[PDB]
């Protein structure tokens, strides 16, 4: 009936359609009313935010137009939805006579957050005619400015009669009174502004590294600026991968502080309205690292969820799957289905993902279950695709090459912000990968200067910085997955591994596992691998008993978060015996990797990880034996001469 | 809309061969391209046919706003005609109606961009003419006498800037009188208005405060590119030089680094930007305004 | 022209006065006694416990003050002045609250609490010089020679608004008289996020703290302090260029007869502190005597260092006797004889040397840990920050300056460059660093001890060569390391089984299997007492 | 080298509810009064305005009794603030005349001149005092002297003698600009360059750099009159009192000395004791009694 000038929105029609959609909708558990129970649960728990999936509207018949109206004119539609939601809540409480305490709900506020806007084509692909539209982005957080106060109510005083005024901002402008409103006192130009008496809001600016799905020819990475307000402030930390939904904006910028002149060319940014920090294709952040942030979120009443939700049916299925007896091999086979055999490599990767138990001594002292792995072997094997899979499955991490890195670039640096024109600190790769997995390729081309820093992180998971303006120690609780290329063309089995790899022997003893990927010619294995590879090209799209990735990630996340194995005497005896045995065997030098206390630590961590798998709470003899067997098999000592350190090429089994 | 000059030349020759007179629109456009853009825009606006498809929920907000503006124009015109006829004080009535009323100018109701493209060597050779606008040139040969003309440059791109919104007309809304105020801008910088300029606020004693409205504004998609000489064009023992190109409208994103291209454009000047102490008179800076791009591969 | 008044402000004034006059097996009243003490000793500040202010009137006064401290502070001052006049005979008085229920983090500040009193904790990084502050100015009118006195500033240079005498109608034309005004001491400090609150994958935050009056020169760089005070806002010109709409202020032109001063409203959050306390005798002299009278005290001491590491009695005996130093001597000819001890621990990466460094940095009073490659010349020694927003330069301390009369832990010592090696050499030669930058010259004390960890040049300690052939240090610095402890691996079954048992005991039992003879507090007390005998 | 940007507007929405005492509503009410008021079933003012336009006399004669009868509020406002209301009524007359003229043409006007007539009680010239300053008064007297016609400007074209920056001024104490306006008026980007040259020497046109171009300006007629009390009623032993009046445009050359007239005008002052001023009258209407045929 009555549209709004410039738009085609009708308030009455939109509110009626929204109310009808709220009162009637279902997924077609799938037959029951959906938003009704969401509203009831919200009013039960006191929450104020409704996360609306914009795709839902496109299913119901009526709102097929409200969908496009929401996409095109978010400003009006969001307020309309909020008012409709409040009216619906009051109607729900009153029409059924639940309880007469409705003043709190009638007074408080509400909000609706769309979070499934249609796919976008990347920020650079937009045009000027897309301003003030709704879009979404994918990227990695780099920096966030501190909290900036924004005035909302200005407070004035009269310097002759003490009369005080309060003024509300209007579209970013304050109307300063020119005359005291008192009849007794109406002196002109007597109003003074008392800064501390005003009421301020919260605003924050975040820098985002966009990662578009489609990349045109010859296009390089860049950065975008996001503005967050009110609750969402401090909801993001650098290194997190997020999916953001917001409004596309524009603004002119002053040429200089002195004048009031503006520049013709505009500045673009994004205004955040929803943030998603969870995905079904990747694990969930280790909650052991974000303990305080959870309490801060609860205090701030922001409704962003860090970890995914688990249903009773899902938990029952998890228990059923853990009940069977082939679970270990099943999971190993599940990891990276496109990679053939390499069962022990896959098992090691799985155990790394699971990780050990993190002890913490009251009165100071830290121990972490991070596990470090290094891969050696022939150059042409599949030791690099393993890195990609771990990088894309882990929540946090960085993939680096040995020769393309630097000591400063791995720890931290100081840079001039191009907007504020001041100097600000930035995080390095090792700090960005905190709580996750750091991938290093060609670890043997890295310079000694660069390699120097890895010692401390691999020793105590911290990095100490003493540079101009900063003197402090930072956490780097990340696992290390490294690859190396043996000297020359092929790993010669007639020489010790120390004569094959280009690393100092002492440095090798720090890693928990060492893998030798040897390439042996055998007709059966060649036939099997060739058939496996050729099968992938039978049809234009992939079709390859393997669990789905979503279920696998759900299981691993649940296991990581909900259980904590502990060690027992039966395990302690075996650990001590095995460590003494290793120290004795092999006792003229630099022919093998000398055993140290790092190996005992590796046994502890691997046994804890195995126990944590399969949903146990006590580490035992089977776990200890499996850990020792895996450690031995990785270096394949069974095919080695314990006197000259050479390999018997005919004893190794594919 | 793409206006080709071969069509104009064919039209002129067809008019000539059967006797009737015709002017050298081709030469006029070639020598003073920048002025004919408005002539063509007005000629088209005088003839644009009506839409045969209704406006639905799957249309652009820009088109929605333009349609609203046109309907509002018609509404004021009809209202004024009715009010004037009611007084009992038709061409004269119409004329006074237009004279005494305000409207939205055509530029705020247009929805299309207009570009020219050069004269083909083949067509010029067949018609026994010399296609100046399609003779490739290096940045070396483009001197001051070429300013204001339509010319073709052959070069290799080296840098392209991102697409950003360039403002052409700012719009403000006055709450006191309900008017919309439009401020043109054609400089690298501008100044925002403060107080209303509409008739009602101008006559009244208490004037309203203007506010900014982004959606009603008139924006343009703007890119700048740097073009460089080819090796075979540089004289012996010299260094290649560069040149600046501006791209506006739907022609953006058509140039990428490393492309060897022929760009057609209008050559225009710009204010001086060097040190004051080295300024001797009215020196100016030059740039090319793009109209058509042809790739070599 | 009668002045508007705040009934609530007055009411809280009388409530505060009643608190002061009422709040008290010998009974006693504390605040009146403290006022008497102030009269006796000529002081300026009062210390009012926050807890005592809570258990009256159902705490309404406590809240009102907490969330509206800024509004009511003048009324509290007025009440204090009146009670002082009543019960005792220019003086500037200060109030100091402390012992708040909770402490916030620098990461958890919000614009909602602007103008509210709270408490924060952090590590100090820098301090500026004490400078006078314009408190209550005096001005002379121009069109007439009238004199106005006691004009308050309130965080900005404020002028009189109207000539006090109707004989002259002057406004906005004045001259400042610097000869009969009053000033206060004013200092700026910079604090940084503490180490263990920094969230994952983020860099630390920094905050400014303004100190006034007698609280000045109570902070010290490199310490952890707890502040209690107000949160405020100050103008910020840098925010221009950020995205978003920045508030502006313009005058209202409606209702003014006819016939442009626009301002911007960008700000940043600061903190004006009122109470600052550092955060780390009594009956315990009994225990001190009991423990000193022991006979195997030295052996128990040696056993008590670094209980989490196995063996290395010599290294422990070095860490001790580095904690306790010698005595500095002065000769008549001006020659100074050093009394400090420096230690180097040499070993390949597979050893457990870094644990000693971590224990020392965690235990010792003044200690700083740093790595060879993650540092720089400026990071060590010092730097000069000439961009003091209000005036002359200032000195930002470095790692060496930190831990003065303390211990500096240097890991990966072998990777240090020639420049910083020379700096450390100068530090050992003379207990001074010479700074010469931006035309500023200075000398800074570095009376420190050095604990360095070094690796063999070839990765492994070739026992065939000598120490000089195995290390990479330069002869000058090498000559002044009076203790070199080379740690090496010996294969033996009983040692191996004992070490494995110890490690597994720590992992399985955690804190239980430590049982050291003495605790950290006892050890620190003993060291503090013993450090002052001068044998 | 670019041209000047433009500015323009158009109405879309409805602002706040119009107040009664605002210039636009005053103009609307005056226009309604002109186009609607009826006497003896006639549109007297519309008809006489049409005839005046036909005759090329750009003035309208109005009687105050009709206005007070039609509406009282604007009558009081005019009687109290004549200097503020008259221009509004003048522009309303001009607006109506535009329509009438354009319609008649098919079937460049200046501002029309309002002339007021009245018959209310007069005030003896000896009773004028402070309370009547800036009000409207009616007087009776005898003309004794009329000056010669003067010349005043209504539209001036001016040029800066140094940089040749041109502009215009319209009148309806105006003074020429004191300094060149080409600086504050940033017409074009190239104008900024043109405003500087020959190295570091700043551009300064000097004080009063403008000159008038007489070939393209328009002027009007102004005249002075003197009015004196009737000699019959003067008190004995005292010379009579007289007063100065100013008229312009269509109220010039209407009377000759010796005529007994009634005058409707405004009581004003000007500067020529400590704070004394010289009163005089601005002529709004003249009514003769017919003398010396
Ligand atoms: N076991 C395997 N399963 C699947 N593909 C394999 C296997 N071994 C080799 N390949 C194929 O051979 C190539 C291995 O090269 P790559 O892994 O990149 O070398 P690198 O040893 O540096 O990781 C891949 O293209 C992969 O498809
Ligand atoms: Mg590879
Ligand atoms: Zn007042
Ligand atoms: Zn207006
Ligand atoms: Zn004075
Ligand atoms: Zn001039």
Author numbering:
A (entry chain C): 177 to 204, 220 to 735, 740 to 782, 786 to 852
B (entry chain F): 78 to 166, 178 to 385
C (entry chain E): 100 to 123, 130 to 194, 260 to 429, 443 to 463, 509 to 763
D (entry chain 5): 2 to 108, 131 to 195, 204 to 303, 320 to 340
Paper lines:
We then performed signal subtraction of the symmetry-related DDK subcomplex and refined an asymmetric structure of DNA-DH bound to one DDK complex, to an average resolution of 3.3 Å. A recognizable DDK feature maps peripherally in the structure and is only tenuously tethered to the DH, via three spatially distinct interaction elements. DDK binding to Mcm4 stabilizes the Mcm4 N-terminal tail that is targeted by Cdc7. Compared to previously published structures, the Mcm4 subunit could be extended from N-terminal residue 177 to residue 155 in the DDK-engaged model. Visible cryo-EM density for the Mcm4 phosphorylation substrate is missing within the active site. This could be due either to the structural flexibility required to facilitate kinase access to multiple N-terminal Mcm4 sites, to some particles being in a post-phosphoryl transfer complex or to a combination of the two. In fact, we discovered that when Mcm4-engaged the core DDK particle becomes nestled in a cavity between the Mcm4 and Mcm5 A domains, which are juxtaposed at the dimerization interface in the DH. This structural flexibility allows DDK to visit an extended configuration, where Dbf4 BRCT touches Mcm2 on one ring (which we refer to as in cis) while Cdc7 phosphorylates the juxtaposed Mcm4 in trans, as observed in a composite map that combines LAFTER-filtered BRCT Dbf4 density with the DH structure bound by the DDK core particle or depicted in the interactome map. In fact, the observation that docking in cis is essential for phosphorylation in trans reveals that selectivity of the kinase target derives from recognition of the 3D shape of the loaded DH.
Loading of the eukaryotic replicative helicase onto replication origins involves two MCM hexamers forming a double hexamer (DH) around duplex DNA. During S phase, helicase activation requires MCM phosphorylation by Dbf4-dependent kinase (DDK), comprising Cdc7 and Dbf4. Origin activation depends upon DDK, which phosphorylates loaded DHs, rendering them competent for the recruitment of a set of firing factors.
